[PDB]
Short mmCIF file of C-alpha atoms in Angstrom, two decimals:
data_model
loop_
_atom_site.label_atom_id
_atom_site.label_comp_id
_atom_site.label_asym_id
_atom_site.label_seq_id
_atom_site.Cartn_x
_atom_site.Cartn_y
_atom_site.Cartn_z
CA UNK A 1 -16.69 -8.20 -58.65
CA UNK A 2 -13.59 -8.03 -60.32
CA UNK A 3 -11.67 -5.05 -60.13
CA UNK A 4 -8.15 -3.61 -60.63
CA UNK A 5 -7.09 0.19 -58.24
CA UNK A 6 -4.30 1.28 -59.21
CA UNK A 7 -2.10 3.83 -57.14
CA UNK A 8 -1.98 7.23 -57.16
CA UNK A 9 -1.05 9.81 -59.39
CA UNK A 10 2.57 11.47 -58.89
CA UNK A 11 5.51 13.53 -60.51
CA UNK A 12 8.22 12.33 -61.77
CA UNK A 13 11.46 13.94 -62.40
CA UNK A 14 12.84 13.41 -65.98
CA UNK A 15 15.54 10.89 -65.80
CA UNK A 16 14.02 9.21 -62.71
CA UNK A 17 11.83 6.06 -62.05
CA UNK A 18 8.30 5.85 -61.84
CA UNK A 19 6.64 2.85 -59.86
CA UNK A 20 2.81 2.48 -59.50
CA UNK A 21 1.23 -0.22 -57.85
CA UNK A 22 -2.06 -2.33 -59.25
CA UNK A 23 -3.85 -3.96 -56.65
CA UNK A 24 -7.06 -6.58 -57.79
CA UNK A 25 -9.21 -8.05 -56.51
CA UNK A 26 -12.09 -10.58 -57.58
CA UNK A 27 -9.79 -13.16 -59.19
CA UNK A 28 -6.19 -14.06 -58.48
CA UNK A 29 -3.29 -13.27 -60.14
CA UNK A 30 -2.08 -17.13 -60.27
CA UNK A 31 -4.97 -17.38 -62.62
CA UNK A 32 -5.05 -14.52 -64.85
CA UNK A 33 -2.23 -11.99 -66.51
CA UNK A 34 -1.99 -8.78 -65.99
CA UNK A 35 -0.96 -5.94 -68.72
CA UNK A 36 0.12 -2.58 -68.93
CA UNK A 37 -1.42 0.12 -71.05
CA UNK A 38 -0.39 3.91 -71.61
CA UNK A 39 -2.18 6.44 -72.81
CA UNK A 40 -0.65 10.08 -74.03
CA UNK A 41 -1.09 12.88 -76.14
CA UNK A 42 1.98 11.88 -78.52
CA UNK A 43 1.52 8.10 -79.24
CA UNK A 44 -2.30 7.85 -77.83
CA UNK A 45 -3.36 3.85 -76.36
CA UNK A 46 0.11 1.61 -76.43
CA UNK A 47 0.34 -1.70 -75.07
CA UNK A 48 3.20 -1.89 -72.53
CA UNK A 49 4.13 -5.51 -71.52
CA UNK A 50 2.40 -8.41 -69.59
CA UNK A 51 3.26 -10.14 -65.69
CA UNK A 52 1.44 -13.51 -66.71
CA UNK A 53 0.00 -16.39 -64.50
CA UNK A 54 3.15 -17.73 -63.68
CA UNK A 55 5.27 -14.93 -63.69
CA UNK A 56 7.12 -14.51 -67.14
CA UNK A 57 6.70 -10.98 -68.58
CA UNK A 58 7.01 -9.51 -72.24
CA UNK A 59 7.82 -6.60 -72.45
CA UNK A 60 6.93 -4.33 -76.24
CA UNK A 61 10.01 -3.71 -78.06
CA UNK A 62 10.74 0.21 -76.93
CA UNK A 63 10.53 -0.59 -73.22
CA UNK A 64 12.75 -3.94 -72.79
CA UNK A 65 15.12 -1.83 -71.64
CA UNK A 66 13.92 0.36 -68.72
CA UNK A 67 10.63 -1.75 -67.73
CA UNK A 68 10.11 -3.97 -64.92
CA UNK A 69 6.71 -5.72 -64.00
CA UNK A 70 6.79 -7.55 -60.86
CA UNK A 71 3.97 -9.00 -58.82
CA UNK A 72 3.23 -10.61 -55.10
CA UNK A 73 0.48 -12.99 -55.36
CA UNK A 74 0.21 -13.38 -51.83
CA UNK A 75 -1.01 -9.45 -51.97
CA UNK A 76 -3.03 -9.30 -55.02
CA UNK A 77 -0.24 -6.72 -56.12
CA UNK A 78 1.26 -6.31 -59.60
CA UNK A 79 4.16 -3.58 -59.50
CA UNK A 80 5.26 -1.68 -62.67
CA UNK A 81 8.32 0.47 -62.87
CA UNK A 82 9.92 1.88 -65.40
CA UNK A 83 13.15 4.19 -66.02
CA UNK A 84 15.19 7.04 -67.20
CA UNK A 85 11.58 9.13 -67.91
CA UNK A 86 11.37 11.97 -70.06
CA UNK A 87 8.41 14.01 -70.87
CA UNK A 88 7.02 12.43 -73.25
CA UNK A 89 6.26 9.51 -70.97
CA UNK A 90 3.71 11.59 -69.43
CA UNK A 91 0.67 9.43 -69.75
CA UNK A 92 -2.24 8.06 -68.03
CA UNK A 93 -0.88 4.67 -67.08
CA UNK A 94 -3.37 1.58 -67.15
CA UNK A 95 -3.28 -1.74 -65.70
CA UNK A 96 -6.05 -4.19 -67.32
CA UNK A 97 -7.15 -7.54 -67.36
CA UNK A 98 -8.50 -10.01 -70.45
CA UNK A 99 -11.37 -12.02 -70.60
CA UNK A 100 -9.07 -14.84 -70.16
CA UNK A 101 -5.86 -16.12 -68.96
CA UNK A 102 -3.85 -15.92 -72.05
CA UNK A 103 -5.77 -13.25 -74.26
CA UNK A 104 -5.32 -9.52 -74.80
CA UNK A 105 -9.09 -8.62 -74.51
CA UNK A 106 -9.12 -6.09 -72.20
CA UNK A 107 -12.21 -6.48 -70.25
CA UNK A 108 -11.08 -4.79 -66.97
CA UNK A 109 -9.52 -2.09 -66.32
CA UNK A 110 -7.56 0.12 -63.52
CA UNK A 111 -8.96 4.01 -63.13
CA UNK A 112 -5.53 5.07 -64.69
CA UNK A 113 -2.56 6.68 -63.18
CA UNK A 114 -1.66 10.18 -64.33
CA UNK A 115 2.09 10.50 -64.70
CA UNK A 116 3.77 14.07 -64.96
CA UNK A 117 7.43 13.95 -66.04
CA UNK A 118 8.82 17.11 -64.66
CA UNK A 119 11.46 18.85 -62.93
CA UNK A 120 9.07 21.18 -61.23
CA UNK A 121 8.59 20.99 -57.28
CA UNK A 122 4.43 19.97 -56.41
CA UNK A 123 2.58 22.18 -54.91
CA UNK A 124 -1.01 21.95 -53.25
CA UNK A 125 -4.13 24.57 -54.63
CA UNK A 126 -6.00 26.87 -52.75
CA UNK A 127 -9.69 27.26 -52.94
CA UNK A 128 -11.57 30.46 -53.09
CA UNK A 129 -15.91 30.38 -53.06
CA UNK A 130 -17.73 31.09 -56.37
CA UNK A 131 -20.40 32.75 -54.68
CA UNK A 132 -24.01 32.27 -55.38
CA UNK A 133 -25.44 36.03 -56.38
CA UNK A 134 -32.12 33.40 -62.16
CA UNK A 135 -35.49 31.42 -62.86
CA UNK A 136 -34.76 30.03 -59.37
CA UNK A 137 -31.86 29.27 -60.35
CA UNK A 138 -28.43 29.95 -58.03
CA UNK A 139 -25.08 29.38 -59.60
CA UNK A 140 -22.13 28.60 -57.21
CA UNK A 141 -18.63 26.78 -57.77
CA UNK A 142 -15.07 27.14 -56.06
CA UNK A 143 -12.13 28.12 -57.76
CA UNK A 144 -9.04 25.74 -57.82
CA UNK A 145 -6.10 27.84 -58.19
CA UNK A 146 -2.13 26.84 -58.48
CA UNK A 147 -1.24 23.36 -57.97
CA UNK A 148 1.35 21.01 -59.81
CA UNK A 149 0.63 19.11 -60.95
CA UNK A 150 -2.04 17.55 -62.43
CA UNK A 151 -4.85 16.21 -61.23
CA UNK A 152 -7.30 17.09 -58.61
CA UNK A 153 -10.48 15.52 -57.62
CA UNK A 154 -13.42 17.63 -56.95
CA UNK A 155 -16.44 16.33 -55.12
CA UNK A 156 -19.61 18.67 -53.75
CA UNK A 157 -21.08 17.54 -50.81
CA UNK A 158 -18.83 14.34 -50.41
CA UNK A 159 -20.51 13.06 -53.18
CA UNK A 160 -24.12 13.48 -52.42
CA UNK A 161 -24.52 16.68 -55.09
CA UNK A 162 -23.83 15.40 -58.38
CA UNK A 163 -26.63 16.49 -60.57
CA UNK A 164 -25.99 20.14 -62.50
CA UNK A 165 -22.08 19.74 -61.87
CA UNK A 166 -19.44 20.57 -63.95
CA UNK A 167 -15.81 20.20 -63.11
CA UNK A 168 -13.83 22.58 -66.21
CA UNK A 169 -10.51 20.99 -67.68
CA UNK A 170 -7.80 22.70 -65.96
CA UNK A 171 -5.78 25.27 -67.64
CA UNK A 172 -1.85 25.96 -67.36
CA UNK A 173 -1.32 29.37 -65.95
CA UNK A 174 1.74 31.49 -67.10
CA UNK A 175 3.03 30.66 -63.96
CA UNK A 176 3.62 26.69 -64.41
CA UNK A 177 0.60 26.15 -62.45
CA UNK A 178 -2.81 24.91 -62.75
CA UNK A 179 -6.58 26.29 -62.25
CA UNK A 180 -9.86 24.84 -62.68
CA UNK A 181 -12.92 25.80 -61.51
CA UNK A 182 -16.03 23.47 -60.58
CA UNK A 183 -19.72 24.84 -60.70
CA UNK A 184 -23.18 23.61 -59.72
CA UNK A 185 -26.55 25.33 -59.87
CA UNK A 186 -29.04 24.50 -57.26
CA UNK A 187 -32.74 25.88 -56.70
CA UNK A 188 -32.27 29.85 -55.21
CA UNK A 189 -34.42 28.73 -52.31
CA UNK A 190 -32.03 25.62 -51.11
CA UNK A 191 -29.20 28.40 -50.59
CA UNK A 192 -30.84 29.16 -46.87
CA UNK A 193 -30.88 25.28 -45.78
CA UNK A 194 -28.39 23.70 -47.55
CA UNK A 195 -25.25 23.72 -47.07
CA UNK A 196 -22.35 23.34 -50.31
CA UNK A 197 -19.30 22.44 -50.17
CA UNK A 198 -16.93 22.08 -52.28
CA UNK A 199 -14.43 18.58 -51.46
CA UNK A 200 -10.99 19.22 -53.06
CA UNK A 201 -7.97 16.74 -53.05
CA UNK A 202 -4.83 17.12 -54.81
CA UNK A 203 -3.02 13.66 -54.27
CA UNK A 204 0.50 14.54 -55.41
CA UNK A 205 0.97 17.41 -52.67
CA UNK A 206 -1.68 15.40 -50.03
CA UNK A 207 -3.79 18.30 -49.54
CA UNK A 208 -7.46 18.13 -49.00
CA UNK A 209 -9.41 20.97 -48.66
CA UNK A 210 -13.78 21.55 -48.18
CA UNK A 211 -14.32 24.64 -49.28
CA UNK A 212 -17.84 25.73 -47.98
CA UNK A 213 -19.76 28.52 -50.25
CA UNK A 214 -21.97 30.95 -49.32
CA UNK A 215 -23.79 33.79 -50.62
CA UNK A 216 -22.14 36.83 -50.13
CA UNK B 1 3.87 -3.48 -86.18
CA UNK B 2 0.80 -3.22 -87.92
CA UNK B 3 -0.94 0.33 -87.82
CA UNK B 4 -4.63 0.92 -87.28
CA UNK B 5 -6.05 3.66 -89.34
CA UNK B 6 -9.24 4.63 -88.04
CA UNK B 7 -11.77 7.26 -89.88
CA UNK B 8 -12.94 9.98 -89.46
CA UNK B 9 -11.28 11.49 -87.29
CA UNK B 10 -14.35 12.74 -85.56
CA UNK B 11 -17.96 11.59 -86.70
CA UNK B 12 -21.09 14.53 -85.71
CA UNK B 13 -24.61 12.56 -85.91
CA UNK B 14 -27.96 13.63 -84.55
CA UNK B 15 -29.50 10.78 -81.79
CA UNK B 16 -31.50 8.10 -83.29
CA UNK B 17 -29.38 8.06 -86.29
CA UNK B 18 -27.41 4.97 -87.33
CA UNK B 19 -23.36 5.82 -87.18
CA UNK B 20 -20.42 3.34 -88.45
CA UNK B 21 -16.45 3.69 -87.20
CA UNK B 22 -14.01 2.31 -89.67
CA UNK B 23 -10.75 0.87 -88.63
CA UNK B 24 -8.33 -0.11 -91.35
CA UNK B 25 -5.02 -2.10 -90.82
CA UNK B 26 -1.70 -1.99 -92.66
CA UNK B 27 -2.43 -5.77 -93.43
CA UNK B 28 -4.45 -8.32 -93.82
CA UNK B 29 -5.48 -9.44 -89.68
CA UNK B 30 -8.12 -11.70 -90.39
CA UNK B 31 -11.15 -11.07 -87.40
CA UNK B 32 -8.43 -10.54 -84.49
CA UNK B 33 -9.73 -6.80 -84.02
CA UNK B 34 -11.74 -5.83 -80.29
CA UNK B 35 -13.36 -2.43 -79.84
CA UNK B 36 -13.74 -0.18 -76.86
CA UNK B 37 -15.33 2.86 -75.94
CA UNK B 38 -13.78 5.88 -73.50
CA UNK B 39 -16.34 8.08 -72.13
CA UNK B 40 -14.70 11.33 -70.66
CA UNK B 41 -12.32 10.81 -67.50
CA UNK B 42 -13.20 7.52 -68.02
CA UNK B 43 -10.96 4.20 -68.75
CA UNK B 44 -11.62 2.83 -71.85
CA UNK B 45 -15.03 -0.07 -71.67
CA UNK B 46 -14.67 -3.47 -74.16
CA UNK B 47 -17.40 -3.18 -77.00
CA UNK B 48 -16.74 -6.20 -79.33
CA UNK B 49 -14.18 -8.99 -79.30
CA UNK B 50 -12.78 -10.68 -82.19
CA UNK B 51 -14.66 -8.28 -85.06
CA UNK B 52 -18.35 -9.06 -84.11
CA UNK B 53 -18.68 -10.97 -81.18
CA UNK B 54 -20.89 -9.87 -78.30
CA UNK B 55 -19.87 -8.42 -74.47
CA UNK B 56 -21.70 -9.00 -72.00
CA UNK B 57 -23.75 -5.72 -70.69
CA UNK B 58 -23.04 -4.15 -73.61
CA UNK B 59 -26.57 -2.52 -75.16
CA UNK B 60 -27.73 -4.20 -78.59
CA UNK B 61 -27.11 -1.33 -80.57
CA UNK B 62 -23.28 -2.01 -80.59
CA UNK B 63 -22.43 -4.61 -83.28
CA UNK B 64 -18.89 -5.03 -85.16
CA UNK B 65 -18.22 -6.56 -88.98
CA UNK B 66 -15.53 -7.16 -91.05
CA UNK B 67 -12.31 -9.07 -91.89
CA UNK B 68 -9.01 -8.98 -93.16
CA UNK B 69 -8.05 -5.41 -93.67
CA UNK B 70 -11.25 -3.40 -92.77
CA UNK B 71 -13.33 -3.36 -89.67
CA UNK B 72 -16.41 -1.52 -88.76
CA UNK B 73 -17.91 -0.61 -85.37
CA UNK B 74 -21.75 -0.05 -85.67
CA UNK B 75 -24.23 1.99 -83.08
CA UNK B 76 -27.92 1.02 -85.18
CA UNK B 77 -29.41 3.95 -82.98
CA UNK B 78 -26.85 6.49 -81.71
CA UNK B 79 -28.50 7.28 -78.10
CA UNK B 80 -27.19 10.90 -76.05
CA UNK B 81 -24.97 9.12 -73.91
CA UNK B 82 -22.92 7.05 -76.40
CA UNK B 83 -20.59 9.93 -77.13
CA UNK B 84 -17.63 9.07 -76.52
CA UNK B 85 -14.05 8.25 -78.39
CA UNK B 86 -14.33 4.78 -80.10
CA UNK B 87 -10.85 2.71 -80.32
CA UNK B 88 -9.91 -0.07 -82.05
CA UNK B 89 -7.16 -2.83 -80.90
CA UNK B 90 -5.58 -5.74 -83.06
CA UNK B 91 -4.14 -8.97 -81.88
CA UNK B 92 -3.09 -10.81 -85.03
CA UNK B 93 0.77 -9.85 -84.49
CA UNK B 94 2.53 -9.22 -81.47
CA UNK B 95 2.33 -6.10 -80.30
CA UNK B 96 -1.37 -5.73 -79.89
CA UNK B 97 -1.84 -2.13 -81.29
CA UNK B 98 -4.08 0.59 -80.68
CA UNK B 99 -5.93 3.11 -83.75
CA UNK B 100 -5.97 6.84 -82.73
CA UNK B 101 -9.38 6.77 -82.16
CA UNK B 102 -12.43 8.19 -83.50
CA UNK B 103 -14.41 11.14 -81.73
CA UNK B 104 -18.33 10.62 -81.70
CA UNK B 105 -19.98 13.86 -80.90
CA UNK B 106 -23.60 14.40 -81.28
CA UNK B 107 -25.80 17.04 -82.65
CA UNK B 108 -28.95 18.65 -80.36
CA UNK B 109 -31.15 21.71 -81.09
CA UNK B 110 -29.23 25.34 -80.50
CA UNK B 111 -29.55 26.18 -76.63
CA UNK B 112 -28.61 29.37 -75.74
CA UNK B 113 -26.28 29.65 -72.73
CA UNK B 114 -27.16 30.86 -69.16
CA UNK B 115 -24.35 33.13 -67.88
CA UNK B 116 -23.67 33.88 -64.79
CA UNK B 117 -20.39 36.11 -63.03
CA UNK B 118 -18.40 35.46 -59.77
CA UNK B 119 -16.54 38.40 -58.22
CA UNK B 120 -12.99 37.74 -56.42
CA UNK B 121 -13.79 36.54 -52.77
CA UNK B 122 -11.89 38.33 -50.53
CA UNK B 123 -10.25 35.74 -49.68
CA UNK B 124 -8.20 35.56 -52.54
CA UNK B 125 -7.83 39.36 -52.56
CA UNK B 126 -5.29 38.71 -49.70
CA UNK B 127 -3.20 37.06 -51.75
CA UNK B 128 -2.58 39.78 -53.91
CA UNK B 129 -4.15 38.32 -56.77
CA UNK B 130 -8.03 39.02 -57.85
CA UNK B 131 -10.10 36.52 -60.81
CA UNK B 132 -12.96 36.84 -61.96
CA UNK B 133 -15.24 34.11 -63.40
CA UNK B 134 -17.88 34.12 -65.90
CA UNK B 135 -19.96 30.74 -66.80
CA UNK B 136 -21.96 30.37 -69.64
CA UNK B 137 -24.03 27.08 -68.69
CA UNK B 138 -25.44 24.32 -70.91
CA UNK B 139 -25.52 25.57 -74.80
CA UNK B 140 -25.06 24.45 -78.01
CA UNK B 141 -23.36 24.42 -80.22
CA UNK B 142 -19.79 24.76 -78.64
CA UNK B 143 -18.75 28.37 -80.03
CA UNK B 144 -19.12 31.24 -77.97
CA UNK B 145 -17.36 34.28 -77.45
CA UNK B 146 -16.92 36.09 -74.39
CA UNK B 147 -15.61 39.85 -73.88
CA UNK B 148 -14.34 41.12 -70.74
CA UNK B 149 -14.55 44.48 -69.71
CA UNK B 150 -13.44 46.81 -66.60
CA UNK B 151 -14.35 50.33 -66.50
CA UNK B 152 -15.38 49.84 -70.40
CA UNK B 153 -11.58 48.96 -71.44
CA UNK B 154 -11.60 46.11 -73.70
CA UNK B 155 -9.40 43.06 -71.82
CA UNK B 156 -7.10 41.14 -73.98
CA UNK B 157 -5.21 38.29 -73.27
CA UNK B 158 -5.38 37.72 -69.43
CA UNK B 159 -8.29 35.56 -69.33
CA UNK B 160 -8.68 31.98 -69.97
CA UNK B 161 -11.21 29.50 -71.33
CA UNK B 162 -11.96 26.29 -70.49
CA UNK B 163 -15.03 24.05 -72.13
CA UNK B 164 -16.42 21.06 -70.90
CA UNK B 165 -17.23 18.23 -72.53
CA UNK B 166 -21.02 17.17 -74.15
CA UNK B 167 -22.93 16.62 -71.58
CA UNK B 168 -23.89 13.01 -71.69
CA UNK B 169 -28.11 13.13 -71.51
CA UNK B 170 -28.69 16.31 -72.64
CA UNK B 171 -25.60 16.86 -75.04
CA UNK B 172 -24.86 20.32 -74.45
CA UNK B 173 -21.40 22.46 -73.26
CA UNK B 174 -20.52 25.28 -70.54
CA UNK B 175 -17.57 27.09 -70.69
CA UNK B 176 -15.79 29.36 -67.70
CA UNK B 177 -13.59 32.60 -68.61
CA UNK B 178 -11.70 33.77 -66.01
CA UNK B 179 -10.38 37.22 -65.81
CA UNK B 180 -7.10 38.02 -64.08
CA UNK B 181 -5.95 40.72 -62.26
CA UNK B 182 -3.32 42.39 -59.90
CA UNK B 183 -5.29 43.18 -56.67
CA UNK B 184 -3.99 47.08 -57.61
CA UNK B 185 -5.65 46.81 -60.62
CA UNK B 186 -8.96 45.45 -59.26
CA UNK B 187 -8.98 47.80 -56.52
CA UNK B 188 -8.43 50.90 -59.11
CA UNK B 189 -11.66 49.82 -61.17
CA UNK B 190 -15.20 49.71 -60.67
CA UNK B 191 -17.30 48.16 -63.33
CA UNK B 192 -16.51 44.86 -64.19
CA UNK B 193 -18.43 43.19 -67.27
CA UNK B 194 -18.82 39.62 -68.89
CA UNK B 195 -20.47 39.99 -72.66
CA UNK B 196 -21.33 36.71 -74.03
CA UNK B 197 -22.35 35.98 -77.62
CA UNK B 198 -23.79 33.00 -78.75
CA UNK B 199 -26.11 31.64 -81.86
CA UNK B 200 -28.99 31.22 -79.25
CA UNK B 201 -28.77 34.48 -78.19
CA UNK B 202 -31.01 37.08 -80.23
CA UNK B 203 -28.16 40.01 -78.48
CA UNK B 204 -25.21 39.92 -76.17
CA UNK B 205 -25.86 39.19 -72.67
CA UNK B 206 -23.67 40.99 -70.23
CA UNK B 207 -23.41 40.15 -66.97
CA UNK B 208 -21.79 42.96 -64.79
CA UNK B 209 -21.06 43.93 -60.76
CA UNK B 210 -19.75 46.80 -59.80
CA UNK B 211 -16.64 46.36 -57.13
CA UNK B 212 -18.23 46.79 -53.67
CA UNK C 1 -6.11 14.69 -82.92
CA UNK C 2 -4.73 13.72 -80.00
CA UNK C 3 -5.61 12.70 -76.08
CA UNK C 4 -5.89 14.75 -74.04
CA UNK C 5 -4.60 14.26 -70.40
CA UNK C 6 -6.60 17.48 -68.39
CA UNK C 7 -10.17 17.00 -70.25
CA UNK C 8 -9.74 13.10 -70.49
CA UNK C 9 -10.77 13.17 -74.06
CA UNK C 10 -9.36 13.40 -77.47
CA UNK C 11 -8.61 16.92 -78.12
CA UNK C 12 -8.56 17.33 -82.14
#
């Protein structure tokens, strides 16, 4: 199956470099280009330049300047970097493939890297239990308090609870810092042989955290 | 560069219901206009290529028309999972460009919202800090209001909303509010209350606990 | 209307 995983996400102090790292698989690079796409709140999807079969790039005309796309074919690697960052480069980075070798149909994509531009320091959340207290019904979560910056993943169960999950947006505290807070409801009566727990990991400080929650 | 108007901006339609995305350019681009679709979280998933041609594994119900200057996007039966933001990409001149996108959110019976209120775990407590979460689960539509209360004072502005997206089968929202205090101020109160209004909702529901 | 980067979704 074809697929494209990029690396992860990351700070980056304004006026520094960001590099992030697309890695494929199912094809080779000798045969196929590979783009760049951003994605932010100011300018929204905007095509970013091209590594193609044989190596040339393009690059769009307001990043000739301060972008570099590389690539090792050898590794099924394709490395962007770009300079001199300010905020408003804070995006969701994409790396995609066409449909074919020369086209812009982008038919694959990477998951996205989320790109802060910031001069803050990161720091990692702690987790604190939601804890279950109607219909049969038990509502539990764990609250995701004070890390920079964004994102975190939140899993319960290592991914075998899925069903009546909801991970909220985060919010930007007063403090610089994000919270979120993930919920589930599960039958009242699975709360005495089940066990829940939360699986947090913040990538840009490296901190993973299982929260296990408990009635009270 | 040529600029991709796409309207509306965001398109409410009940499931079942046929719904249309326009996507005009600044000129003429003959068919060299593909679609995609971005589900929430999600990277964005190739609908059409060049103005109407197929994808494979995309459902039937997607089809694309036009040419020259204005393009249209076409779900014949909207279905609960095919909301969504809708974007539209041309290739005619270099650089391929991007529309802003067009929201599709979809319309569902009013549900009222089940709420439900978390104390501070002691844990946190430690840290000198003490929140306080209320949920209001799976409602519609999205406006609610919820009003905190400790010892029956009125809170204003230290709490803090967040909404999920529509749910993708059975289209409806939650929302959390969390309340934050100073453990001191915690510690000096007893009764702490979540009121929730919504549409669904014939009065208020509070949920309370007292501290301890 | 605009994208949003912590709900993953335009934001209008």
């Amino acid at each position: 199956q074809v697929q494209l995983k990029q690396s992860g996400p990351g700070l980056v102090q304004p006026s520094q470099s960001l590099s992030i790292t697309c890695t494929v698989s199912g094809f080779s690079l000798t045969n196929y280009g590979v783009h760049w796409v951003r994605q932010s709140p100011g300018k929204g999807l905007e095509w970013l330049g091209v590594i193609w079969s044989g190596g040339n790039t393009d690059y769009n005309t307001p990043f000739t300047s301060r972008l570099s796309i590389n690539k090792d074919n050898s590794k099924s690697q394709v490395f962007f970097k770009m300079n001199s960052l300010q905020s408003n480069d804070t995006a969701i980075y994409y790396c995609a493939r066409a449909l074919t070798y020369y086209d812009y149909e982008f038919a694959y994509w990477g998951q996205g890297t989320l790109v802060t531009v910031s001069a803050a320091s990161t720091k990692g959340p702690s987790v604190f239990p939601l804890a279950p207290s109607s219909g049969g019904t038990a509502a539990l979560g764990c609250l995701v308090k004070d890390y920079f910056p964004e994102p975190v993943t939140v899993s319960w169960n290592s991914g075998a609870l899925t069903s009546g999950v909801h991970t909220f947006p985060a919010v930007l505290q007063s403090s610089g810092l994000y919270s979120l807070s993930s919920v589930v409801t599960v039958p009242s009566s699975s709360l005495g042989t089940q066990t829940y727990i939360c699986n947090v990991n913040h990538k840009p400080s490296n901190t993973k955290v299982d929260k296990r929650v408990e009635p009270k | 560069d040529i600029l991709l108007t796409q309207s509306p901006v965001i398109l409410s339609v009940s499931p079942g219901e046929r719904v249309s995305f326009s996507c005009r350019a600044s000129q003429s681009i003959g068919t060299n206009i593909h679609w995609y679709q971005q589900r929430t979280n999600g990277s964005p998933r190739l609908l059409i290529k060049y103005a109407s041609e197929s994808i494979s594994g995309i459902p039937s119900r997607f089809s694309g028309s036009g040419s020259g200057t204005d393009f249209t996007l076409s779900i014949n039966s909207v279905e609960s999972e095919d909301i969504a933001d809708y974007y539209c990409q041309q290739n005619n001149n270099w650089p391929t460009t991007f529309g802003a996108g067009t929201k599709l959110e979809l319309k569902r019976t009013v549900a009222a919202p089940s709420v439900f209120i978390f104390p501070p775990s002691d844990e946190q407590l430690k840290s000198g800090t003490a929140s306080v979460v209320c949920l209001l689960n799976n409602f519609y539509p999205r406006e609610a209001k919820v009003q905190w209360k400790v010892d029956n004072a009125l809170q204003s502005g230290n709490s803090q909303e967040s909404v999920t997206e529509q749910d993708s089968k059975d289209s409806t929202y939650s929302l959390s509010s969390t309340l934050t205090l100073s453990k001191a101020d915690y510690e000096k109160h007893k009764v702490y209350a979540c009121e929730v209004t919504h549409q669904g909702l014939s009065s208020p529901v509070t949920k309370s606990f007292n501290r301890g | 209307c605009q994208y949003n980067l912590s709900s993953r979704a335009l934001k209008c």
